[PDB]
Every structure is written in structure tokens, then in C-alpha cells.
Design a protein around this ligand. Structure first.
Ligand SMILES: [Ca+2]
Ligand SMILES: [Ca+2]
Ligand SMILES: [Ca+2]
Ligand SMILES: [Ca+2]
Ligand SMILES: [Ca+2]
Ligand SMILES: [Ca+2]
Ligand SMILES: [Mn+2]
Ligand SMILES: [Mn+2]
Ligand SMILES: [Mn+2]
Lengths: 108, 89, 89, 109
């Protein structure tokens, strides 16, 4: 019944939750939980960034809109929008046209 | 191989292009294409806002189409709403 | 040296940070900060809607702040509006 | 009267108009006009892209949402937003904190 889009959003939600539940508040990602998510589920999209723990700490600080040292789902979803955008940009990197084609995206 | 989360994000790109590649500019979803997108990809609680309202909201440069960045506004809002629904009620 | 157009774009970044660096997250303009942004930076035909109305429009992820990409919605809307007015007597 | 932000927007509109008026329709950019604007007024921000005329053509095609081979101001301002975004991103490229600092943006300084 669920559409492709709904199934993709559900994947984002499920992934968030499988880490948020571990420690502390069950609906927010603490630093350890976020770092685990990024390390495992964004191993390709954030491959270079994953090599530098302080980069990942800065990404989390950036996304932590209300400054509580936790990521809500609302805060987290911006990262997902940014990466989706970045992947699409990669697909068009150096595009000479005409018309439309994708190269490989992020992490490929 | 990409992770399931990574594939999901690339699938979001694919979903957009199913509608943007219909006609005209390849990163333009026109008013009728957005109506079809909403009817096909989004749940009733998103559809009930009205395709006309969604279009006006998403077309922030008032150029007559929703581009990929504009689409990501809908994605974000669908995401937030679905996450809230997962804890109801 | 950058061109005047390039400087204008970097100045838009500068404008955002006058408000985003007041407090909290360095890329968050909170609802109270956005009132000051609008009062100082936008003309009356933009301000008059109301700061809380703008905030609800711009805070697309409903996280309680306007980030830089959310601010660019306001910039885009201000631009289109100003361009339209440049052709009115 | 005018705020900083208002002056910046005014710059954007003025730069659009100083090319749109040259040829054909006076309130849209044709390919030649857009190429000239990019070559001159985005010479740093689009320095790499300016070396490849076909890249510049694709950028115009992407922006041309109503596919009439002209860029209206509405279509063009998405390039301004994207470049402003890109410059800010460059200022934070590799940022390890602590807190908030900008490196040089797009096209240097
Ligand atoms: Ca937790
Ligand atoms: Ca938080
Ligand atoms: Ca649009
Ligand atoms: Ca926000
Ligand atoms: Ca012209
Ligand atoms: Ca056009
Ligand atoms: Mn939850
Ligand atoms: Mn594409
Ligand atoms: Mn910054």
C-alpha cells in the first residue's frame, strides 16, 4: 500500500529509531548514537567525514538547532535532506547537457 | 553496495524524477505533475492540504515549477509528519 | 577582488550571521531573533505579514529556528518581490 | 533607508537587468546574455565552470524552468541562492570547530 516515497521516509525513521532508543531519551540521538548511525549507515555518503571524528562532532553541533546536545528527528532530517541534495549534485557534477542524465551519486 | 539508508535517499531522488522527467524542464515538476505526485506518493493526511496549496507553498520563486530543492521541502515535511504519526496515539 | 555581484552574495551570508550569531546554534535564527532580522533588513511590505507568520513559513522542519537554507527562502521571496516592484510606477 | 540585505538584492536585480536589456526581450536573459553575465560578474564564483561553455549551457538549461530558452528573474534568482549556499558551504569546508568560523568562500576571499 505504501508508496516508494513513504517507504523511503520509513527507512529514515526506522534508522533514526534503531539508534535513538539505545541511551538516554529514546526519541533523540545523543552524540554516541549519532556517531554510530553515521559510521554504519552513512559509511559511504560520509566516507571522508567519518575519517575525522571532529568533523562528525561539528556536523552534529550544526544540526543541533535547540542546543541540547541531542538530535530530535526534526533536527536530524535536515542532514537527510542535505545528503540527498549532495548526492543529486554529484550525479550532475560537470554536466554538459543537453537534456538530463545522472552519473553515480555520493559514495560511488 | 550502498546501505539501506543511502539507497533510501537515492530513491527519493528517483521519486522526484518520475514526475520531473514527464515534460518540459528535467528539474521542473509542474502543477499537474505535483498533483499526480501527491496522489501517488503521499498519504491522505498530506494530500488533504490540497495540491494547489502545496504547489503555492513549494514554488518559492514563483516560476511555475517545483525544482529538486523545492521538492525537498515536501520531503522534510512528510518526514516530520510521519515520524510524529509513528508515536500516535 | 570579487565582483560586486559576488560581494552581494557573500554579504547575504553576512546579514544572516548578524542574527544567527546572537545566541545558541550558530546557524539558527530563533523566533525572537527573526523579529529583529525582519525589522532591520526587510522593507515594510515584507515585515507587515508579521514575524510569527514568517517564522512559521520559514521553519520548514519545525525545529524552532531558521537555518541558513531556510533563510534563503526569505531572500528568494524578497528578491522576486523587489524585482516585480522595480517595474511598477 | 535601504538595509544591507535590500542593497544586496538591489545588486542582484541591477546585474540581471544590465544584461537582460541588451538583446531581444528586455526583461529576460537569452543564452548570450547569461553567458556574458556569468563570464563577467561570476568570474570567480564560477571560475572553473566558465572554462567549459557547455557547462554554462547546461546551467542555463537547468534554470530555465518553463523551457523557453530565456531566463526570467524568477528563474535566475535560484542561481543566486545556490551560489550563496555554495559560498557558505565553502566557508565551512572541513570545519572541525570549535564553535563558528568562516574560511574564505567561493572564488577566494
Ligand atoms: Ca537516545
Ligand atoms: Ca537538539
Ligand atoms: Ca520554483
Ligand atoms: Ca528550521
Ligand atoms: Ca534579453
Ligand atoms: Ca524561461
Ligand atoms: Mn520517534
Ligand atoms: Mn537530475
Ligand atoms: Mn556560518
Amino acid at each position: 500500500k505504501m508508496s516508494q516515497l513513504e517507504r523511503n521516509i520509513e527507512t529514515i525513521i526506522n534508522t533514526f529509531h534503531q539508534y535513538s532508543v539505545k541511551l538516554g531519551h529514546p526519541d533523540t540521538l545523543n552524540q554516541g548514537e549519532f556517531k554510530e548511525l553515521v559510521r554504519k549507515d552513512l559509511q559511504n555518503f560520509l566516507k571522508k567525514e567519518n575519517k575525522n571524528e571532529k568533523v562528525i562532532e561539528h556536523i552534529m553541533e550544526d544540526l543541533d538547532t535547540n542546543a541540547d546536545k541531542q538530535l530530535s528527528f526534526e533536527e536530524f532530517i535536515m542532514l537527510m535532506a542535505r545528503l540527498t541534495w549532495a548526492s543529486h549534485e554529484k550525479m550532475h557534477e560537470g554536466d554538459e547537457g543537453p537534456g538530463h542524465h545522472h552519473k553515480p551519486g555520493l559514495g560511488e | 553496495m550502498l546501505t539501506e539508508l543511502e539507497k533510501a535517499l537515492n530513491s527519493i531522488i528517483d521519486v522526484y524524477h518520475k514526475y520531473s522527467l514527464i515534460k518540459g524542464n528535467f528539474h521542473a515538476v509542474y502543477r499537474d505533475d505535483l498533483k499526480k505526485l501527491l496522489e501517488t506518493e503521499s498519504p491522505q493526511y498530506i494530500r488533504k492540504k490540497g495540491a494547489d496549496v502545496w504547489f503555492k507553498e513549494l514554488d518559492i520563486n514563483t516560476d511555475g515549477a517545483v525544482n529538486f530543492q523545492e521538492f525537498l521541502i515536501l520531503v522534510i515535511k512528510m518526514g516530520v509528519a510521519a515520524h510524529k504519526k509513528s508515536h500516535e496515539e
